[PDB]
């Protein structure tokens, strides 16, 4: 197999896959990156609001 550097991750979630475009992905779904902070879920991937 091929072992690379770190740019990808893995997430546990049962939410469906949809046809849209959002930079941030959380286990519950996808959230806009417009707002600086977020309260949905701690686990995040990509450009996301800071969790509070």
């Amino acid at each position, epitope marked *: 197999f091929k072992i690379r550097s770190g740019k990808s991750s893995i997430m546990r979630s049962d939410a469906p896959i949809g046809k849209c*475009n959002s*930079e941030c992905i959380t286990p519950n779904g996808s959230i806009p*990156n*417009d707002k600086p902070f977020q309260n949905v879920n701690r686990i995040t991937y990509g*450009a996301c609001p800071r969790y509070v």
Partner: antibody, heavy 127, light 110 residues
Framework: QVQLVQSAPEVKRPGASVRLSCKASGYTFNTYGIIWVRQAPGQGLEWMGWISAYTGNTNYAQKVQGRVTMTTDITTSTAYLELRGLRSDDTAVYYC????????????????????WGQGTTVTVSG | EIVLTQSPGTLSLSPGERATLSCRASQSVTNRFIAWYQHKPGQSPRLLIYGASSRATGIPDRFSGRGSGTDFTLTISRLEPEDFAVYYCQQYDTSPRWTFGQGTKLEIKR
């Protein structure tokens, strides 16, 4: 629709002064300011100045500060750009476009961009 | 001033191929600024991407803005003949100054 109409092309001489127009339709004039950008032959776009109907305050580019005066008349939604002491490099196509939001705080960047442009006035200055 | 450098200056792609343009800012910019324009020759410039990644009203879904910080990108999926133009980088700052970019030309066809 939101539409911007500009003045007819002008052919001035070096050292003269040219007055350019930008009439606005489809949106209330006081809410947004109008900014002017020019394209010299074989050159990229260059911002020059911004004026607001809500606030007469004007910010001009460093290249043209002493020679540029921008005025606005609410009736009838007409913006004027005056350039004095024209020199050969000033020969360009001058566009106008709606800019900032005035009268309300904003969050969406549409009110921080230039969407509805004019056809553009082509100004040629030569002796 | 803040200087935005576009890349590549000339890009030649075949019709139906994705195209990626890159604009690097001299200093960090909040995604609230940095917008992308299109200038077909002989016509008024058009606004494609406002904000950082938001399509303007009445713009084809293929155009996709993205990026953050110094680097911002515009990606065109399934290039069509309407798309041949010069594309311009833009920023904004508190005292209104709209510093443009040099421009990238799409010399499509082969």
């Amino acid at each position: 629709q939101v539409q911007l109409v500009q003045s007819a092309p002008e052919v001035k001489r070096p050292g003269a002064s040219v007055r350019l127009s930008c009439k606005a339709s489809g949106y209330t004039f006081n809410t947004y300011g109008i900014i002017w950008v020019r394209q010299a032959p074989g050159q990229g776009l260059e911002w020059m100045g911004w004026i607001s109907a809500y606030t007469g305050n004007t910010n001009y580019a460093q290249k043209v500060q002493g020679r540029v005066t921008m005025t606005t008349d609410i009736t009838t939604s007409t913006a004027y750009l005056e350039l004095r002491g024209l020199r050969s490099d000033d020969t360009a196509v001058y566009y106008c476009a709606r800019g900032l939001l005035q009268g309300a705080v904003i969050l969406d960047s549409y009110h921080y961009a230039l969407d509805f442009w004019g056809q553009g006035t082509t100004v040629t200055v030569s002796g | 001033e803040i200087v935005l450098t576009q890349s590549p200056g000339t890009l030649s792609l075949s019709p139906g191929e994705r195209a990626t343009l890159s604009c690097r800012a001299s200093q960090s910019v909040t995604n609230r600024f940095i917008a992308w324009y299109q200038h077909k020759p002989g016509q008024s410039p058009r606004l494609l991407i406002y904000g950082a990644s938001s399509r303007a009203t009445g713009i084809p879904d293929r155009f996709s803005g993205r990026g953050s910080g110094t680097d911002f990108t515009l990606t065109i999926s399934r290039l069509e003949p309407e798309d041949f133009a010069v594309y311009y980088c833009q920023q904004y700052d508190t005292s209104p100054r709209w510093t443009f970019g040099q421009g990238t030309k799409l010399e499509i066809k082969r």
